[PDB]
Amino acid sequence: LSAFVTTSWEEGPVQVARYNGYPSIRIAGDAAPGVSTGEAMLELERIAAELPEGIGYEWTGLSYQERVASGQATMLFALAITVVFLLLVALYESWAIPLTVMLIVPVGALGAVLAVTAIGLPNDVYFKVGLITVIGLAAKNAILIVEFA
Amino acid sequence: LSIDDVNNAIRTQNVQVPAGAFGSTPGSSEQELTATLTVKGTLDNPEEFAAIVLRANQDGSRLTLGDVARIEVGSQDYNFGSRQDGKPAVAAAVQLSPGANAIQTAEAVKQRLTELSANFPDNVEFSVPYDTSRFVDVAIDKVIMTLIE
Amino acid sequence: VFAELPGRIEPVRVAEVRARVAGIVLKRTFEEGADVKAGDVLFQIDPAPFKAALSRAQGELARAEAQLFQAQAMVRRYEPLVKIDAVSQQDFDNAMAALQSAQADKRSAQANVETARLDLGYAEVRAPIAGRIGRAQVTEGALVGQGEATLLARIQQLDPVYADFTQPAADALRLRAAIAEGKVAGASDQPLSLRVDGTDIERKGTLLFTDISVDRSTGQIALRGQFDNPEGVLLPGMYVRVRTPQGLNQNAILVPQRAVQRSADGQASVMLLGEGDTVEVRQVTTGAMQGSRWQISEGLQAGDKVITSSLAAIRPGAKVIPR
Amino acid sequence: VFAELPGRIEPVRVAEVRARVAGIVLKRTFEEGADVKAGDVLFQIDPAPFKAALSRAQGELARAEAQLFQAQAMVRRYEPLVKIDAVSQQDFDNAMAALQSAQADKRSAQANVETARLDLGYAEVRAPIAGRIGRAQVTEGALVGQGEATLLARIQQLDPVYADFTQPAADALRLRAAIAEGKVAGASDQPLSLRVDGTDIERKGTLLFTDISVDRSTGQIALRGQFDNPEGVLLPGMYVRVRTPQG
Secondary structure, eight states: OTTTOOOOOOOOOSSOOEETTEEOOOOOOOOOTTOOHHHHHHHHHHHHHTSOTTOOOOOOTHHHHHHHHHHHHHHHHHHHHHHHHHHHHHHHTOSHHHHHHHTTHHHHHHHHHHHHHHHTOOOOHHHHHHHHHHHHHHHHHHHHHHHHO | OOHHHHHHHHHHHSOOOOOOEETOSSOOSSOOOOEEOOOOOSOOSHHHHHTOEEEEOSSSOEEEHHHHSOOOOOOSOOSOOOEETTEEOOOOOOOOOSSOOSHHHHHHHHHHHHHHTTTSOTTOOOOOSOOSHHHHHHHHHHHHHHHHO | OEEEEEEEEEESOEEEEEOOSOEEEEEEOSOTTOEEOTTOEEEEEOOSHHHHHHHHHHHHHHHHHHHHHHHHHHHHHHHHHHHTTSSOHHHHHHHHHHHHHHHHHHHHHHHHHHHHHHHHHTTEEEOSSOEEEOOOSSOTTOEESSSSOOEEEEEEOOSSEEEEEEEEHHHHHHHHHHHHHTSSBOOTTSOEEEEETTSOOEEEEEEEEEOSSOOTTTOEEEEEEEEOOSSSOSOTTOEEEEEEEOOBOSSOEEEEGGGEEEOTTSOEEEEEEOTTSBEEEEEEEEEEEETTEEEEEESOOTTOOBOOSOGGGOOTTOBOOOO | OEEEEEEEEEESOEEEEEOSSOEEEEEEOSOTTOEEOTTOEEEEEOOHHHHHHHHHHHHHHHHHHHHHHHHHHHHHHHHHHHHTTSSOHHHHHHHHHHHHHHHHHHHHHHHHHHHHHHHHHTTEEEOSSOEEEOOOSSOTTOEESSSSOOEEEEEEOOSSEEEEEEEEHHHHHHHHHHHHHTSSOOOTTSOEEEEETTSOOEEEEEEEEEOSSOOTTTOEEEEEEEEOOSSSOSOTTOEEEEEEEOO
16 A cells, blocks of 8 residues: 555544534533523623624523523413412402402512522522412412401 | 446545544554544545546556546436526425414515525525415405404 | 565575476486485486487497598508608698598587487486475376476475565655665664564574566565575465564654644644743654654654643643643 | 656666576576676576587588698699699699688688587676666576576666656647647757655656657557666656646
């Protein structure tokens, strides 16, 4: 082979990564302790806005699901509030009594937020559903008074 | 020369080579630079294809593909052709997948094509000479107008 | 630098014992495989015609000798008579001319007899060289010598032996260029080392000949070395590997392989511990590879402090603690 | 415009030292790979028959010389006698004719002797040209010259060398047409540049010959240039690429 083959050292990729049919570079990381992911991705969008035109970014997996959930939480809350209000007016044959009792929601939210901030846990799905359960049970407590009233 | 000769020459000379890497497993306890061999097997441009050797003698004279054939980059097939308003053009028909929105899908296709319109060469322009969705749009609009009156 | 080249064992002298005269092989005088001396009779071919030719030549020689005897007697008788003028001077000169002609004819007849004797002796086939004789290519009673010179046997000399090995032409040109540059000193005096495949048998030898012509089919140059073989272990034709020196580096710098970095352009570089424990980038050229160490042809000098660890975690000009 | 054509290095003179006569190689008088001069003895073939033939020719020459001496003596004796009528003019003319015949016979015998001597000298295998001798194709004790001219050795002249390279005939015709039309000027005076593949060794040369015939199997013409090789770097048979000016 030495009669017709020469060897020259170059550099090349030992692994090639493609995403959605375009050549891609996969970047992974973890947030610092005490730092939430959401502010991190916001800063990352700010950084990517400074990249040269034509260089793109996309979220995948956990980040994708987190983006969707952070999107959906607010309409969840709105739908819950409207449905409880409508069943509140249905039961009491009045609107004023429903407004009266729905005034109890912020105090339960107050307690949940103060506790989670005092112990320092993040706004996880666990705290989220615990807040929802507190919300329902505060509603029950308010009903137990307002019905006899 | 026969035609099967040129066929076999093209087949044997325009082939990728999976060479490998030296220092590969099982690797000796001594050597420490496994590295790729990366042989060039395929040809990229018409000039290289014209350099395909059909017959070569010991003295140095070579018969090449370019001596007997015209090499170029053309269409794989010539059964079909597309014209628009008397001018040659390229076109493609999109056929909907079952159970999908139309106005949202048509708007998405138009918006994606418009976003790619930022990247078409300047001499080329896109168009949508055929679009069923518009009819549907007009149709529903007419219906809603009836629904009002 | 040593190159392991492929070669084959050859005998120094090969004698193809072939029949020169047509005839029937009557007897075989040698036993196959024995050592034979020069002049030993190996085959006997029946002389039917050569004996007759020798007899005819001998008869002609006898006739010439008879005429010479007659001329000698005539001259001996005429010599005293011419002094007393008993015969004319012309007759004496004629007798002397006849005597000289007879001597010349006898010499010519002797030459013819010698030629016929050599032709006949080409029937007692003898070993031209000493050595070990192989199998006989013909058996007793077979016809040989008709048309072509039939091969009868082969004789080979087994000590010393040659190793004919081969080297790619490009490698030879590179070696010559490096020697010319002063990069590598000539290793003509270093003995070639010969190894038989599958065995631990090693022999030492000397390079004799390097061909100036490149084989057109293989693009390689042939080389011939000579190896002593007193025990007869090295047999002709055996495929052998020859370690031949590719010259001597006097200032060979060998660095651990994990200390050489390569850039995107393929240029090789090394991290050096500069003054003040600063890390500097010095470009180098890598030569050959010995084990796990790169040979460096340029870019390094004796006493240089190269970094052989943590290379991926160090930037140029950064401060490090040398261990 | 320069065209890089493939070619090979070929030595100016190649002498295939072959055996002209049949016999056993008794000795080899040269070391393989050394430089030999013209006329140097390389192989000694056993001169068994040719020595005898030379002896026979010498004997015939001696007989012719003896007859010539007899004729000369006869003519010398007869010359003064014819001046005094002591012998007939016819006898003197016969003696002179015999003397001339003897001289012719001596010349013929000398020619035979020289033929035999050259035949014998065709057994001391001498180098026809000076140059480097290669490996001996036969060893001592081998029978050579039987039937065919057995190749004994090869001698090559390494300075200068020729580069035999090849160019497509269509390209040559296009260049010639462009010259005839006047678009390009003939580059006959520009030197060829030979490069050895894989090395930086570059050599200048001159175009010697362009072939008129086209190779049937490939359709390309052969060209020969000459390159100086003082250092012996260019070895025969090496694949080289010759850059030739195209006008």
